[PDB]
Amino acid sequence: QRQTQTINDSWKFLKGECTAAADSAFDDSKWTSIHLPHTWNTDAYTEKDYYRGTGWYRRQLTLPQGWKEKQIILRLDAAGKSATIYINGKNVGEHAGGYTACSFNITPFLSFDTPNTLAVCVDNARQDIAPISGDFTFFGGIYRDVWLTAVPNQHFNLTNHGSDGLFISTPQVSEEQATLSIRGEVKNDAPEKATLELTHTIYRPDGTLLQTLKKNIQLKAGETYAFSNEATPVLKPELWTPETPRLYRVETTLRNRKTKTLLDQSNHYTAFRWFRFDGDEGFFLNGKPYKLRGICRHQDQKPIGPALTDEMHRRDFLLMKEMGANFIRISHYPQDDALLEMCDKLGMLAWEEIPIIDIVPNTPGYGDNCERNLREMIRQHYNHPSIITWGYMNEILLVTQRKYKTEAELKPVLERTLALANRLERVLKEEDSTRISTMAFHGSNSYNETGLSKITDIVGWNLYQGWYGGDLTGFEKFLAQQHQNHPTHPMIVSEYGAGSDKRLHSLHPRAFDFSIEYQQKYLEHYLPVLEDTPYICGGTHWNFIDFSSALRDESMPRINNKGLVYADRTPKDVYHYYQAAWRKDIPVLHIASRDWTDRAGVQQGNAPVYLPVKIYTNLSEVELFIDGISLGKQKTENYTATFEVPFSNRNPFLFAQGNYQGKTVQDGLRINFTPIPACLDANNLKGLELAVNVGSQCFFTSDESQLTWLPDQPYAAGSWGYIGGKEGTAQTEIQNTADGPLFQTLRNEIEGYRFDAPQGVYEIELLFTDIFRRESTFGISINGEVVEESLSPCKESGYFRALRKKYYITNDKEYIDIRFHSTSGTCFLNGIKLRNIY
Amino acid sequence: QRQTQTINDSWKFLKGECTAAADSAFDDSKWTSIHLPHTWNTDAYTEKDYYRGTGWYRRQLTLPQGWKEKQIILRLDAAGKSATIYINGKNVGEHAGGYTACSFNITPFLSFDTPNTLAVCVDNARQDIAPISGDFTFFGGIYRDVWLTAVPNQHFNLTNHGSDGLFISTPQVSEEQATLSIRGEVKNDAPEKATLELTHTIYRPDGTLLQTLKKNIQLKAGETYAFSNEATPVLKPELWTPETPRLYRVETTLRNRKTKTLLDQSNHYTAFRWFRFDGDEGFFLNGKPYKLRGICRHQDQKPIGPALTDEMHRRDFLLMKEMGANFIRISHYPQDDALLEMCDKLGMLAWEEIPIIDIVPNTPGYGDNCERNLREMIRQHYNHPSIITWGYMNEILLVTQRKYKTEAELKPVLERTLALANRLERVLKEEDSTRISTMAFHGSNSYNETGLSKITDIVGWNLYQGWYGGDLTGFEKFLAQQHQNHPTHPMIVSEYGAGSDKRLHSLHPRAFDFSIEYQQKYLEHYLPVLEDTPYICGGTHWNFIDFSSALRDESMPRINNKGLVYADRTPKDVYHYYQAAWRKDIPVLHIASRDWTDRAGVQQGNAPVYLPVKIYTNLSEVELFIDGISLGKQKTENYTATFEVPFSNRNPFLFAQGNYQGKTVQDGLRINFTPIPACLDANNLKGLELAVNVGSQCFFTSDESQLTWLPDQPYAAGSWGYIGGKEGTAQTEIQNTADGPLFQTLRNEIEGYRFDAPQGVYEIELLFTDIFRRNRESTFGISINGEVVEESLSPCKESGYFRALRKKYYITNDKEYIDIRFHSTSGTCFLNGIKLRNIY
């Protein structure tokens, strides 16, 4: 019979190229001991220039004696970007593509007397394998399961494009009945002919036998037999939806006809559903209007990269499912079998695509490798009823339009692009007539003008109005114009999202301040448009997670921070906005302050400091308390309510409650609050560390020091603040700080900074980063005394590099008046911190 | 005037040796751009064998035109373990010791017409500098502030052992009056004699002027002039305590006598307190009995090492102060000026020591460097009234008695050790007649037998009964025995504590399971002994933080996890045990489940799963609710109550309530719960991932995958569990897993593992690690329902010892059970974990 098990354990690894590394007798004792899954690119979570090249893997294979007469199939579920397999020094085969499986019959190369050597040469530098461009890290290594499967000489074909070799589909489905087709290949690897019986057993969702199909077959030695068996039509089929994920098990078994002894067996699920996409009325599932409530999911986790164990894939799935998602865009590459298994069985519709992104290059062999990857994806995941649509391109004009401006320059590239797109559409439809084709576009009409949008069955728009420029209302406007101009192209919003950073909060959130609050504003605008617009089939939020993209700077360098959950899968508060909107079956009541647990604010006297506390909920009304005091009830709108909360005590307890479907519902949490005096005097300076995020309207709380840097404020008599200047912002990474966003904002052309404070000795810390890559040079004086004659941050440290300078100052006045004196370029300040010492 | 500012910015760094690295014209454009503070040993948070050797730092100095006529003083507050300073290629000076400041007048080496090159060669491999042994990482680099100070040619001496050059103390203090001695040195670096006026101005705590002292002084060109001025006695001084940290500012000023022009100015605090240690009655502060409620604090933070900014030092202090500590053992080395400032001003008594630990080596120069470091600590930190005691050795017999078992080998080492201890005690008392000397011992009477305990004023015992062997009650027994035999030696319990790991929880906590709950049992035992025993002056908990110690394995390799707070300074729940016990002025009500937010347990049918929920509180009575349902009121004892909580729903809200000082007090939080069926059937296998920590009585929740692995349970009819074998445990690091504690426990000589479960296709994952390196070697087969799945598995042969193996098998079950059996071939059969899912 069949035996399948992993060989993930007991590997040796070497980064780089290496002489004789495939040889059996090679000494690899000084190599690194590792366990799969593995990537050699955990460096990508700190370094922009992560290693792209070769890595070698070696494992001993000592085979059971029980396998001596069996075929042994090696399966690598994934290796990025390409792999070459050696057994005992001999090249067995290779695979191009980092997200699809490969498999090899390795029986001829193996010994059963001596130990065998499996060596794999993996390469992630190859420019002829998709992706060659895209907003994520191209991790190198063997980062999914590796298997050995031992089968008898007559067995199902396990070397058809790394798949199971069986293909099951439902040519007709309706409420009244459905048909079922069961297809595949049997291989006879014996030296003699064979007479076999093939059986398909089909089971109802409750597990009872529905039907048995039997068929005798005869195979010559070495023959591959292709079968295609139709079942008795299924009457009143139990239909599959994400809410009701009814699956019919199909067990396919192979027996020696005479002896009836079992040879090979393969289980799959099938399911009964039909669907369609309408340009006017949206998506339909089993005849009923159905809104696609979707998310996109990248497959990495800081700092292990894509080297996730399968319980981590299931963890991700369960978080998405508990959020109320009914649709996933598995992007930009096909993903672990463990994920798709959950989509089938727990219920989530799915879109899966291969990573042809940004530009079709004139790279020899690239097209041929994409075609193969498309066949591999479709054949490997053919039997997942959750999957309703295949894609192969994402924003394929984005870099093209950046690199080539003139119609002359564009012509060859657009020809090449349109040709590859039409070629893959044909391949797609050859491989699978039972699913819909899709393509994702960036927000430009060039996808219509070039003809790209005529090619697939449906289209996806990746839309970011209100994030990458424009207005939030430009979203529904863009879609309305698409629908007017191309009403027969059904639309999914295949990406939308906004970046956020737990460290940043704003009372006046703006795009690219990276505040938690602005992402909320953005998503609170987008989700109702998706829900309420009939010609929007649905949307897939970009992204479920904060994910690895080594080329990114912005507030969290190396990370795309548009997640609904943090990289460690802790949900952001806004996860519960979705959960409130998408789950009616349970009460949802979430105080949205888990992202904002370390609060501070300027206080007048001993009066409370008011800060907003948001609530996400599907209750119609909620009451918030702080340290036992009611702040009143509020009616919820768009699944949310915000309270203006009086902060005073240092460790307040927030508590909310209301009623849902007849039951009382509650939430609560403690947070931290630190008041900062508006008016400094000798008493309130003790223990005070007055820190200011100059040039910003955000609170910045360091996740390294836990200190909150307040939003900038203009000087007023009796108080403290800036004099003159204008806000400036950069998104380039700042060297030599963990507190990037503090230095990425500044007050430019600043004239002064003033604190009204008592006489004494003070520690003043000035923060600089020059972000304007003649060169800015300026003096600094404090209360009439020169503290810097001629400071040039860029001459001293270079651009985009933090300088933190502390000064001890003796104040013999009733104020500390810091003045900037420009001699070249402009004066700027990125942060300031004051403490009284004496 | 005096100008003091950092030069922490704009450095270049190179690890390793580099010829000509000091030269002004050297090309460092490919070096690494860094900002101080800096360590080159962030590797220690992953690698045991962290780099010890040389590192080079280079900065350009372009001096202000306004400094042309000034003296320029360079101060490195710390460089581990040694630094050699070069200015424009010229060797300016050097320092040995990784925790004390050094300073240099660099004026002679600088040009004001051209840019200057500052180069520092730092070395953390040197064996003639303490520590050479100890349970912490010897981080290399310049990890505290670096300063330039510009002063006139007449100024206060800034190159006396890296100190401020002024020394203020209170020779007599009582409630009625106190005396005040203001001493220091003035330097005249000018070619002309100077006639100067020295002024001391003394302010009351409320900032009003108390007294002005003025003195004419005359210095020859080049002279170092020592001054010593007595203030008028202070009548009815406002006394300093941690609770009432009253400070008197002393402002010292130097003016040119003829012109009256201000030259230099230096501020310090003084304060008035007196204290006493008694062998029977403990510690007294300002004539009153006073229990020292202490913590120890190491100075690193994962993953930045000791390269903390000063707001991080202040964060640490505020956390300790808010817990109600009134005493800090600043150990095993002196720490940032930022920390001591807060001890003075916000109020905490202090013990500070240098790191002479484990064994006194026979290394030339070692003793001399220790003496210099002691003098440097005392002079640099002289003016902190928070400090009441200086130490210089910790567990100085520990490695000695491990290494040397013969009297011939021991005798010279003990001779050497007693010699150095006596040498440093003399130095301490020469340097400071105003503070108490202390030494910390490991828990052995040999410190008395060797005579080490007769040297210092007081003694510290580092005690771990109930952790490193023994019963918890052995703690108070040890101390009673000391008090009996050495009644005149006043005692501090200078270390005590137990390791914990947020990932591990146990209903039956035991030592070295690293559960959160055992550390709680340990500390709940110790703290009342400390509080209630009169002849115990107090204790300093080891440690406030989970800290770097690269040589450690155990549950969190590279980390000593005996903290009250995690490395990132998030408090553990037991922080709030201390807070409840030590804060009377605020209500403390803490549901002690922040360490246990991801719960799971075996469920019978649909009945609730009971798990304990502890509360730490200074309330006398508390009520706990789960999802709005009251679980009743319990009376608290030892600042705690535990409820047996019925879990069922997936995301329960826990809420606690009570009254304190006439007001309602509340706490609450949500946590996650996952029920696991005791009896598998087709219904409840859907979406189930049944994971078990074989060989352990601990729940293990992975901080990587968030999956909880259940405590092991014996097979019972209709259920699932192990057959045969006994528990085994290792503390060695396990390779190739983030989930070390899962692999560090196993069931040895296991016979089977069984799940009663319906027919179907299952994924079985088996976890292995061979922990018996002293093996002959373990080889075994495994069958599942008679099907062989391994005919000859040997973890140690295939992967080696202490390395994770995780193997997945797909099996087809045509029975009503899944019966995994282990078949010995060689050595023993073992299993470290198992996980089951139904696939078809």
Ligand SMILES: [Ca+2]
């Ligand atoms: Ca997998």
Ligand SMILES: [Ca+2]
């Ligand atoms: Ca400092």
Ligand code: NA
């Ligand atoms: Na800023």
Ligand code: NA
């Ligand atoms: Na275990």
